[PDB]
């Protein structure tokens, strides 16, 4: 049984009657063919508004039956529009067990005055026979079962999926919020006159450089009044945003001096983010100073990509005054570029 | 496995419905040829405006369907114009397996009031044969699923290009290193005599109760030392590992008391995480105990799921001795179970 | 669109047309059908008449 | 025709793209069998999201179309899932009429990158012979017209629910009565000695230039009297018969100076609707006097439409003496016309 997410339970209400119909002194039928005996009206607890009755002909109702008992069912009151029904009849013998039971194969509709039943019910001679016990002590016993169907209803239920939904990771969010809110600050940064503030453990975890003068028993002097003079405060605030959160929102406008800050403080992750930022602006004129900053800050991937770019576009780099100043002030780096261009991407002649 | 300069991932959106549909007293078919009986309109959470319905003819649709039960599927609600879907019908037998599970090879174009189905679905006499088990206890149990597709989407990725890449993030690893080489910490706590050390701001960032305890009536006098003698250290160290790392590796072995710790320290994600763990560890022989803890430690959706599980398996849950202790200990939970099962059996 | 009158507002109806047809007899026949979309009672009898302005 | 109590108008929306296409020097087709030359991507103003294009095989697509010019219609990009359309192809002759036009009876299904059309569109030798005149100056021009169908909407118009009805709006009629009956005005103006009567608040309700003049320096001392001595009363009465009634009945007969007053008094809606009249009265013999007004009185859409008319009819606008007067009076208009003509004739 597969699990579903929606389902419907179409239920059609069905009720069952239980009726007894016993007539005494049946051998005194007192009439010839074509005469009926209407029963007493009966119902059940619900809905108690459908009044049923039975008509029975001891002799044959028609010339075709004659030597035949015939039994019918009739409905006399219908508060609704119409009612379809099923029925099973039976003759109770001397012992009381059901014999000669015939039922209806269709759900016949009934209106007030409509009858349904078996006119060819049982042979009258077979009933009047005594060996089968169908007429005990001049009593005729009949067993009536009437089943009534009602209008169909659909409860319908949407089954449960309702699995556990978990929240996302929040550590970056609350640690970043802890950065601005600065609850229970332990150290007071100083940057170009600004007096920033931060904790101690997160810094000594992010940067080996910070833990260098923190592990060497330098707490009571340097932690309260730590002085930093290299980085400007805007970039310095941005790199603590990186320290506490792990994100660099506006790196694209400050990729150079934040790379200088990353080189100073050994934040290798931010080093490679600055490599990322300064890679994707490679124009034919700025590659000289890109090489300058790459060699000054010991960058690897950005330096290699800049060397490949200047080897590709040396037709226009050489005209720039940055390249001439590069050649003058940096003897070794031009030689390194010559080395890389020598045994790569021109060995075909 | 070559690597390319670009990559296109053309994805077709697919939504899979599931549907149970059960009939009682079918042998009283009530009508001749031409009868149709409809089902209820059903849909999943997506998109909540694409409703479907079944439609079955008991005796048959036409004269050549005299000895055939015909089954159809009708689309009743669709805001858009054209929606196509490929469906599969089956019959759950007495045990519950599918029988004549047939599929349509095409995904027909459906519109507002369009029907498709198998007119020659199953034989009438083959269904009404009792030896086949196709009518268990005079009940028809069909199982319906439709696979609906939407307009395909193109992500249009473009890899290689600039070689630049991040060497991920070392945050969790270095905060674990803070567990490793001890720390010049902020505060020394006490867990049943055993000495643990942890910082203050990191606790105050992720826990309202720690921030409430730290800055009120303790930051002036007893800032260094505080004692917790309520949660045992073998789960306490793991809860502090959740505070430091953002995740808990060891949850399923020992979620029975760390969820109590999560309620005691108001960590919402950790509550939900152990809630999911105990939801996966629900079983018949302990569901009363999961209900006891879910009511004791303010779990809500876990309480609802455990109540639903007990409603599903109420026959054998009553046999376990845990329910008998639960009756005399917490009668309100028993009343709540009766309350929920009353709504479950509202029609009957 | 589904339609009914004010009373009793529980028997909703709608129409359906096949512009080309349904079967091989209706290759050159427009077909019009009327169906009942919702009913609270068990069954309802009716007679209908169609027209083209 | 009886009136029914319920009705429902079913509308399936249809839009239309009207298209010109023009190719030079068709004798230089430059290739044999197998060549295609495309067209630019085109769309209409609404919704400006359905992008179509064309393609033509100068020799043919298959061996059955060796002597057939092949034509197809192609859908390059669309935001919706699927679009159907009915299309019609045509060829313009030398005289400017349509010849050998043929269309398709079926609303074909189009999707991203699918073509539809007639491979056997026209006979290549029939185009090649000059007797029919279908190749004017070795150039081919195509008339393409396509209609796109859209989703169904039903308005479901219910009638005879309520016999009562509200008479929309008579407020414009009473405000028109405020001008004719003059209904105890407050401030009496003076237009070239003639006396007109106006109320005070409802002028400033719509006029930004009156709201500034009425409260500053005028209401304190000379509140009853102020003089307008630049606009003639024959059009000033028609102008004031808009601020009250919300409309202008007598527009076209003196739209030449109504727009002159419109930018003078900064009435935005009056300026646009009089720009409508002066755009509708565009012709070759008055384009100079239209453009001089559109430049002196800060018209923008009128100035754009006028210069676009002059660039297209510049063969005979230069013959007019008003153009010669505009040249010697306003050189900047001539410079703007040269700039727009250079932008139009950028490829040459």
XYZ file of N, CA and C in Angstrom, chain A residues 1-12 14 84 86 106-107 147 149 154-156 158-160 162-171 174-175 178 183-184 186 199-201 204-206 214-215 219 269 272-273 275-276 279-280 301 305, chain B residues 16-25 28 30-32 38 40 42-44 92 96 143 162-169 171 174 178 183-184 199-202 205-206 214-215 219 243-246 269 272 275-276 279 301 305 308 312 347-348:
354
model
N 0.801 -1.210 0.000
C 0.000 0.000 0.000
C 0.837 1.264 0.000
N 0.905 1.936 -1.147
C 1.681 3.178 -1.231
C 1.031 4.304 -0.443
N 1.872 5.224 0.004
C 1.426 6.394 0.750
C 1.050 7.488 -0.239
N -0.118 8.090 -0.035
C -0.620 9.147 -0.897
C -0.638 10.459 -0.129
N -0.703 11.567 -0.868
C -0.773 12.879 -0.238
C -2.188 13.438 -0.188
N -3.117 12.866 -0.950
C -4.525 13.216 -0.849
C -5.348 11.975 -1.153
N -6.538 11.905 -0.563
C -7.378 10.731 -0.731
C -8.839 11.112 -0.551
N -9.713 10.223 -1.016
C -11.150 10.398 -0.898
C -11.781 9.082 -0.475
N -12.697 9.159 0.481
C -13.436 8.002 0.974
C -14.899 8.200 0.597
N -15.265 7.728 -0.590
C -16.638 7.831 -1.075
C -17.471 6.772 -0.373
N -18.320 7.211 0.551
C -19.188 6.322 1.309
C -20.629 6.555 0.890
N -21.335 5.471 0.592
C -22.765 5.502 0.329
C -23.451 4.865 1.526
N -25.875 2.939 3.787
C -26.808 1.832 3.624
C -27.330 1.439 5.001
N -34.154 4.010 -3.935
C -33.851 2.693 -4.469
C -33.533 1.755 -3.313
N -32.790 -2.675 -2.002
C -32.506 -4.087 -2.196
C -33.355 -4.859 -1.201
N -31.478 -6.438 -8.627
C -31.408 -5.036 -8.997
C -31.908 -4.159 -7.857
N -31.436 -2.914 -7.851
C -31.875 -1.926 -6.868
C -33.040 -1.149 -7.469
N -32.835 -3.508 2.486
C -31.660 -2.650 2.551
C -31.935 -1.401 1.729
N -30.375 2.193 0.257
C -29.213 3.017 -0.050
C -29.632 4.478 -0.036
N -18.821 12.285 0.164
C -17.374 12.201 0.008
C -16.741 13.031 1.114
N -16.145 12.360 2.101
C -15.543 13.087 3.213
C -14.273 13.808 2.768
N -13.430 13.137 1.970
C -12.135 13.587 1.451
C -11.150 14.117 2.492
N -6.895 15.203 3.058
C -5.559 15.440 2.529
C -4.564 14.838 3.511
N -3.832 13.824 3.061
C -2.952 13.073 3.937
C -1.732 13.902 4.326
N -1.062 13.445 5.379
C 0.010 14.215 5.988
C 1.334 13.953 5.288
N 3.999 16.742 6.085
C 4.340 17.445 7.339
C 5.643 16.965 7.994
N 6.711 16.982 7.209
C 8.004 16.566 7.728
C 8.664 17.714 8.482
N 9.738 17.388 9.198
C 10.417 18.395 10.002
C 11.209 19.312 9.084
N 10.925 20.607 9.159
C 11.694 21.617 8.449
C 12.687 22.255 9.407
N 13.964 22.187 9.049
C 15.031 22.649 9.931
C 15.474 24.044 9.509
N 15.897 24.886 10.447
C 16.472 26.178 10.071
C 17.851 26.002 9.459
N 18.313 27.062 8.805
C 19.617 27.041 8.167
C 20.715 27.324 9.188
N 21.955 27.326 8.707
C 23.074 27.724 9.547
C 22.984 29.210 9.863
N 23.216 29.548 11.128
C 23.071 30.917 11.587
C 24.354 31.516 12.137
N 25.445 30.746 12.174
C 26.637 31.146 12.914
C 27.262 32.402 12.332
N 24.851 35.505 13.436
C 24.972 36.031 14.796
C 26.399 36.430 15.147
N 27.415 35.803 14.549
C 28.766 36.285 14.816
C 29.005 37.642 14.154
N 27.333 40.119 16.268
C 28.198 40.318 17.423
C 29.328 41.285 17.119
N 29.274 43.082 22.279
C 28.953 42.761 23.662
C 30.173 42.162 24.343
N 30.512 42.719 25.508
C 31.589 42.234 26.373
C 32.933 42.258 25.649
N 36.739 42.765 24.711
C 37.976 42.529 25.441
C 39.141 43.384 24.958
N 36.583 41.358 20.173
C 36.984 40.317 21.104
C 38.400 39.849 20.774
N 38.868 38.835 21.496
C 40.258 38.401 21.412
C 40.400 37.020 20.779
N 39.541 36.080 21.181
C 39.658 34.699 20.727
C 39.408 34.563 19.234
N 42.480 35.775 17.427
C 43.623 34.870 17.529
C 43.350 33.539 16.844
N 42.092 33.268 16.510
C 41.743 32.146 15.655
C 41.861 32.465 14.176
N 41.407 33.646 13.749
C 41.475 33.985 12.333
C 42.912 34.198 11.880
N 49.605 38.098 20.863
C 48.658 37.765 21.918
C 49.085 36.583 22.772
N 49.862 35.652 22.228
C 50.286 34.471 22.964
C 51.517 34.730 23.825
N 49.115 40.804 27.373
C 47.688 41.082 27.508
C 47.427 42.402 28.225
N 42.531 33.173 3.123
C 41.249 33.176 2.430
C 40.981 34.525 1.778
N 43.100 35.124 -1.242
C 42.623 34.568 -2.503
C 41.357 35.281 -2.986
N 40.534 35.828 -2.080
C 39.415 36.656 -2.549
C 39.905 37.924 -3.239
N 42.771 38.110 -4.779
C 43.250 37.581 -6.053
C 42.104 37.447 -7.053
N 40.964 36.925 -6.593
C 39.741 36.830 -7.387
C 39.275 38.186 -7.892
N 41.799 39.766 -10.330
C 41.938 39.036 -11.583
C 40.987 39.574 -12.644
N 39.719 39.761 -12.292
C 38.695 40.066 -13.292
C 38.505 41.568 -13.492
N 48.487 33.084 -7.780
C 47.585 32.889 -8.913
C 47.403 34.174 -9.707
N 48.555 34.750 -13.568
C 47.585 35.169 -14.574
C 47.959 36.516 -15.180
N 4.946 15.167 -9.147
C 4.350 13.843 -9.045
C 3.279 13.863 -7.962
N 2.039 13.587 -8.354
C 0.932 13.455 -7.421
C 0.762 12.003 -6.992
N 0.101 11.824 -5.855
C -0.306 10.511 -5.383
C -1.726 10.613 -4.848
N -2.486 9.529 -4.989
C -3.916 9.604 -4.723
C -4.471 8.231 -4.380
N -5.164 8.154 -3.249
C -5.887 6.965 -2.825
C -7.373 7.224 -3.012
N -8.125 6.202 -3.411
C -9.553 6.380 -3.636
C -10.272 5.071 -3.352
N -11.160 5.094 -2.359
C -11.728 3.886 -1.772
C -13.248 3.944 -1.812
N -13.859 2.840 -2.232
C -15.303 2.693 -2.352
C -15.735 1.604 -1.381
N -16.837 1.830 -0.678
C -17.475 0.778 0.095
C -18.772 0.379 -0.607
N -19.240 -0.837 -0.301
C -20.473 -1.468 -0.814
C -20.650 -1.278 -2.322
N -23.463 -3.479 -4.579
C -24.697 -2.761 -4.873
C -24.318 -1.605 -5.794
N -25.967 -0.049 -7.982
C -27.082 0.889 -7.915
C -27.648 1.279 -9.280
N -26.993 0.964 -10.396
C -27.450 1.459 -11.691
C -26.987 0.525 -12.802
N -27.538 0.763 -13.986
C -27.208 0.085 -15.228
C -26.114 0.865 -15.957
N -18.387 10.411 -9.329
C -17.204 11.250 -9.339
C -16.492 11.146 -7.990
N -13.524 13.257 -5.211
C -13.284 14.598 -4.708
C -12.125 15.246 -5.452
N -8.708 16.917 -5.818
C -7.494 16.740 -5.038
C -6.319 17.410 -5.731
N -5.395 17.917 -4.918
C -4.133 18.476 -5.384
C -3.165 18.499 -4.210
N -1.881 18.616 -4.530
C -0.835 18.729 -3.528
C -0.641 20.201 -3.172
N -5.164 -1.768 -5.784
C -4.689 -2.442 -4.586
C -5.596 -3.624 -4.272
N -2.628 -5.581 -0.658
C -2.241 -4.201 -0.898
C -1.369 -3.973 -2.117
N -5.419 3.141 -6.933
C -4.271 3.980 -6.613
C -3.900 4.732 -7.878
N 37.653 32.280 -16.083
C 38.677 32.685 -15.125
C 38.909 31.551 -14.130
N 40.174 31.184 -13.936
C 40.556 30.023 -13.140
C 40.301 30.226 -11.645
N 40.095 31.472 -11.216
C 39.999 31.889 -9.817
C 38.974 31.104 -9.003
N 39.364 30.725 -7.785
C 38.561 29.887 -6.903
C 38.946 30.181 -5.462
N 38.005 29.999 -4.542
C 38.274 30.199 -3.119
C 38.785 28.880 -2.547
N 39.695 28.896 -1.571
C 39.972 27.663 -0.828
C 39.041 27.491 0.362
N 37.731 27.474 0.083
C 36.643 27.343 1.052
C 36.794 28.202 2.299
N 36.425 27.647 3.451
C 36.383 28.395 4.695
C 36.887 27.504 5.817
N 36.468 28.243 9.195
C 35.866 28.760 10.420
C 35.530 27.663 11.427
N 38.826 25.977 12.727
C 39.602 26.757 13.687
C 38.856 26.916 15.011
N 40.037 25.780 18.686
C 39.809 26.432 19.974
C 39.371 25.434 21.038
N 42.149 27.303 25.617
C 42.040 28.716 25.254
C 42.288 29.612 26.461
N 42.797 30.820 26.224
C 42.727 31.876 27.225
C 41.316 32.447 27.186
N 33.806 30.992 26.204
C 33.823 32.444 26.134
C 32.421 32.973 26.411
N 32.277 34.290 26.450
C 31.031 34.918 26.864
C 30.215 35.462 25.705
N 30.854 36.200 24.797
C 30.127 36.846 23.711
C 29.591 35.828 22.717
N 30.331 34.744 22.489
C 29.867 33.714 21.566
C 28.643 32.995 22.124
N 25.733 35.514 21.771
C 25.294 35.711 20.396
C 24.236 34.694 19.998
N 24.396 33.443 20.421
C 23.513 32.377 19.974
C 22.493 31.951 21.017
N 24.381 36.172 31.877
C 25.702 36.785 31.951
C 25.645 38.253 32.355
N 24.792 39.048 31.712
C 24.810 40.487 31.951
C 23.918 40.918 33.108
N 27.581 39.597 36.105
C 28.695 40.325 35.506
C 29.377 41.271 36.487
N 27.218 25.021 19.795
C 27.351 26.474 19.908
C 28.561 26.970 19.120
N 29.697 26.287 19.265
C 30.926 26.701 18.592
C 30.866 26.455 17.087
N 30.461 25.255 16.673
C 30.560 24.839 15.281
C 29.357 25.239 14.437
N 28.170 25.345 15.024
C 26.966 25.497 14.237
C 26.320 24.196 13.830
N 17.275 26.106 16.614
C 17.696 25.164 15.584
C 18.074 23.816 16.179
N 14.941 21.943 16.887
C 14.359 21.380 15.669
C 15.173 20.184 15.182
N 14.415 17.330 17.330
C 13.032 17.005 17.002
C 12.954 16.112 15.772
N 13.716 16.447 14.730
C 13.791 15.594 13.549
C 14.424 14.245 13.861
N 11.828 12.245 15.585
C 10.820 11.899 14.586
C 11.258 10.701 13.761
N 5.738 20.761 17.074
C 5.500 19.971 15.874
C 5.910 18.519 16.100
N 3.452 15.373 15.503
C 3.840 14.186 14.748
C 3.733 12.916 15.585
N 0.093 12.058 15.807
C -0.331 11.436 14.553
C 0.136 9.988 14.460
N -2.188 6.689 14.133
C -2.006 5.656 13.116
C -1.903 4.267 13.734
N -16.185 11.651 10.604
C -17.346 11.074 9.900
C -17.942 9.850 10.578
N -17.154 9.075 11.315
C -17.665 7.872 11.965
C -17.281 7.821 13.439
